[PDB]
RNA sequence: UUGUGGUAGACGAGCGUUGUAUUGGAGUUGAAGUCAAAGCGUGAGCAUUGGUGGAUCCAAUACAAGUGAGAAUGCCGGCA
RNA sequence: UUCUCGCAGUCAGACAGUGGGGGAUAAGCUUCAUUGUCAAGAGGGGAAGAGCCCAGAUCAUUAAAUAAGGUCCCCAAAAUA
RNA sequence: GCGAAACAGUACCGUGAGGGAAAGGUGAAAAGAACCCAGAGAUGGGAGUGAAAUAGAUUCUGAAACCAUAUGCCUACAACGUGUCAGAGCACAUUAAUGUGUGAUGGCGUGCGUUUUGAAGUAUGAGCCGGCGAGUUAUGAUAGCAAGCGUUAGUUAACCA
């Protein structure tokens, strides 16, 4: 800004006896070289605050929308087995689900090595925890698989 | 030969087999329209109008006059209101006339 | 987040500059003088939209009264001949349109007594 | 035929170059070299080089007889000038510019061949207008 | 919308007329002069073109003013020089150039127009009665 | 003096219209064939039939 | 039906620009920039086409603005 | 045009008529109340015009009719006694 | 963008503290035009290479202001902040449109912005183009709209995961 730019206060001309434009400082925002009064600064915060209850209501609504998506059927811990990281197997899984561009983010609460083993190569497939869910992430899925043990936690959480 | 036919608020000299442009009638293309208002075809002028005299004209197209850009402003008054007027019209011609 | 904004500036100046053309001298060369001329001409046309009919009605009455004085009678009685007796809806310009067709306006100016 | 010959920025002011070459437009090289060798102007002797270079161009690169060749076009294209300063009185300083001239000379053989350029621009115009046309007949 | 109107253009036809100032007065002939030169009495008028016709006035040197205007009303003609005023009266232009009398009268009562200054030459004025323009085969009519 | 208003392009053109130059005379030298200027010397030097200057 | 002068001044609906979140599309088979033209719009604009041009851009929904120059005896650089 | 909320702008006016004050009832003067206008409102008439008379203009119309004002030519419109 | 993409605090300025700049991009790879012609010369025209040289070192793109050239049109008695509404004539054909280009002439025609009681003014600012360029934020208060919760209500801070 006008004070941040390095420079002095010397005036190239005196204040009278010349029809030149009035100048008062070495650097000015209206003078070349820079010195804009207001621009980007590392203080802008974008702070927002929403009550916990309202956010939980928004959650419950978006889950219920997802729970009625009719294309997100139930999945069991057993089927994550029989493979360690062979995405080819998971590619056959994805094909069998008739999903091509579905940004499938998988909810996990077992931390079974097989899934975070995969789902880090292609941008399409990722796996994230139930405790880390976000509304955009939930609707970013457009297709998802839910594990049945966490249904108990979901009904407990209303 | 000649005829004196008023469309809307505008009265026109119209002869037989002449294309011309009048105010908008919102008439779609193709059909034949018999207008009532007419005066002094060639003789025997009726006072307000010509009684029972019809002018039977065919409409062929609706057009618009060139883009008229109009700006209102007063000097040193911070007022530069700009607008664009389009002037619709109907281009048509007459085919028949009856007394 | 810097934005120069000289592109849409170029577009807006270009779109002010097309209509300002065909003028004598550098009037249609620079942004400011060209816009001044365009606005002034717009005002001139706005006022002339009235001035044209104001002068054309005078042209009508003068052209009619030329022939009227040729036949001696005046415009003052002419309106009486039409509007009062044998009421008609005749307008000024069609009179001269009939004058420009020989031997027709004579019939109208002669039925004034009938 | 063009017979264009460029110079690219010899140090002369273009005002004087145009000034000296109004006198050559439309004339024949037979009566051009002589008048260029007699008129006592700085640019006169300097453009004789370009004139004879154009003669050589016409005689060698194409090789027509050239007896009907006439001076088609002179021009003094304005190049980037040089900037200098000189001290003046009261401590002031005068600012001076050095103007050079890009010179290209064209020799024509027939009083024609611009009209051909006119129909070439018209061909551009038509390719434009039917290019617009195909936008509508496209289904 | 509007009724299209047309006028004659670049096909004007003009004639020669004869008129005499035997017992006339300045104003009552000058009004007819303006009327004829304008052509406002004929339906062939076009402001974009010429409308008047040739006119010949003959023997302007017997026109008479009513009242003492010939002796007391004066015209000053100032040249571009300082003190270039030529003072003339009604009585003196009879024994002098009366042609300029009708000339300045007719020019004063018409708008400053390039056609009007071109119009004014279509009328010819001489205090005499003989002129080589007599061979124009002209239409003769009084009070013109 | 000092200008008050800027001079227009067409005033520059009209002042330059009389600021041009005309052509020059020309003649033929019989002995030394050359299109020389009238009443001057030739390429070989003979203004008339007289050439006292060196031919080099 | 009332209408439709208008500074100050107040109210409402707005447009373009960058990048981001997506859903999409196009791109050496020549993107965008560029100018020329006798377009479409109540408006900021939106275009149509050719050449030039030689590589990313665009439609819609939202998001946050070094987001919008005719003037500052303005500055920068050129032309005068 | 009442009441509350929010934003105001603004306190440099002048002109024309009356009543006045001052001057010298002098001012394109100064200051008021009242009657209108300009500021912040086009236009027509007045030779142009910041206010005077007619007057409050969405856009278009080589449409008609009126207000003030005008009808010897410019400059459009009349004569009769 | 640190002033400083580049040999920058460099050049340069004042003796001294101190002050203080500007400018990059060729093309795939120089493969950077062997050789010929003109001209001493740079240079230009060829050839050849390069897809392409109108990519040839001025070396990504090259608006406009600026300067010229010319198709056609108009113009040397003319009183004009230069255009508008009509408009013949002249030359034509398009984002097919009551088509376009120019305008002999007629009617009309005292700028932009700011200042203000009010400015075509002889009140001021502007030779000109272009490029940039001056209503944003930390906290809190008031008012307005919408949403959430709900009249034993509602909301959290700091901090941690």
Curated annotation (Swiss-Prot), chain A:
Q: Keyword RNA-binding on this protein?
A: yes
Q: GO MF terms on file?
A: rRNA binding; structural constituent of ribosome
User: At the top level of its lineage, which domain of life is listed?
Assistant: Bacteria
- What cellular component GO annotations does this protein have? ribonucleoprotein complex; ribosome
Annotated spans, Disordered? 2-33
Keywords, ordered alphabetically:
Antibiotic resistance, Ribonucleoprotein, Ribosomal protein, RNA-binding, rRNA-binding
Query: Which residue ranges have biased composition labelled Basic residues?
Result: 8-20
Q: Mutating residue 17 to R leads to what result?
A: After 30 clindamycin passages; confers resistance to clindamycin and josamycin
Asked whether the UniProt record includes DNA repair among its keywords, one would answer no
Q: Name one GO biological process term.
A: response to antibiotic
Reported function: One of the primary rRNA binding proteins, this protein initially binds near the 5'-end of the 23S rRNA. It is important during the early stages of 50S assembly. It makes multiple contacts with different domains of the 23S rRNA in the assembled 50S subunit and ribosome.
What family does the entry list?
Answer: Belongs to the universal ribosomal protein uL4 family.
Instruction: Spell out the subunit comment.
Output: Part of the 50S ribosomal subunit.
Protein's name according to its UniProt entry: Large ribosomal subunit protein uL4
Origin species: Mycoplasma pneumoniae (strain ATCC 29342 / M129 / Subtype 1) (Mycoplasmoides pneumoniae)
- Residue numbers of the full-length protein present here: 54 to 211 of 212
From Swiss-Prot, chain B:
Q: Which terms are listed as keywords in the entry?
A: Ribonucleoprotein, Ribosomal protein, RNA-binding, rRNA-binding
Mind naming one GO cellular-component term on file for this protein? cytoplasm
MF-aspect GO terms: rRNA binding; structural constituent of ribosome
Q: PROSITE patterns annotated for this entry?
A: RIBOSOMAL_L21
The cross-references to Pfam families, in alphabetical order and at most eight, read: Ribosomal_L21p
The record's family statement is: Belongs to the bacterial ribosomal protein bL21 family.
Q: How does it assemble?
A: Part of the 50S ribosomal subunit. Contacts protein L20.
The protein depicted here goes by the name Large ribosomal subunit protein bL21
* Gene from which this protein is expressed: rplU
UniProtKB/Swiss-Prot annotation, chain C:
An example Gene Ontology biological process: ribosomal large subunit assembly
One GO CC term on file: ribonucleoprotein complex
Q: Which Gene3D superfamilies match?
A: 6.10.160.10, Ribosomal protein L20
TM segment ranges: none
Keywords in UniProt for this one? Ribonucleoprotein, Ribosomal protein, RNA-binding, rRNA-binding
Annotated GO molecular function terms are: rRNA binding; structural constituent of ribosome
Please name the CDD domains in this protein's record.
Answer: Ribosomal_L20
Similarity annotation: Belongs to the bacterial ribosomal protein bL20 family.
Protein function: Binds directly to 23S ribosomal RNA and is necessary for the in vitro assembly process of the 50S ribosomal subunit. It is not involved in the protein synthesizing functions of that subunit.
Q: Which HAMAP family match?
A: Ribosomal_bL20 (MF_00382)
Name of protein: Large ribosomal subunit protein bL20
Lineage, top ranks: Bacteria, Bacillati, Mycoplasmatota, Mycoplasmoidales, Mycoplasmoidaceae
Curated annotation (Swiss-Prot), chain F:
Q: Which cysteines are joined by disulfide bonds?
A: none
Keyword Ribonucleoprotein annotated: yes
Task: Cite the Pfam families for this sequence.
Answer: Ribosomal_L32p
Per UniProt, the ranges with Basic residues bias are 6-17
Q: Where is this region: Disordered?
A: 1-20
GO MF annotation: an example: structural constituent of ribosome
Q: Which GO terms describe its cellular component?
A: large ribosomal subunit
- Keyword vocabulary terms for this entry: Ribonucleoprotein, Ribosomal protein
What sections of the protein cross the membrane?
none
Looking at the record's lineage, which domain of life comes first? Bacteria
What is one process in the GO biological process aspect for this record? translation
Keyword Ribosomal protein assigned: yes
Q: Which SUPFAM superfamilies match?
A: Zn-binding ribosomal proteins
The record's annotation in NCBIfam families points to: rpmF_bact
HAMAP family on file = Ribosomal_bL32 (MF_00340)
Q: Which family does it belong to?
A: Belongs to the bacterial ribosomal protein bL32 family.
What name has this protein been given in UniProt? Large ribosomal subunit protein bL32
Gene name of the encoded protein: rpmF
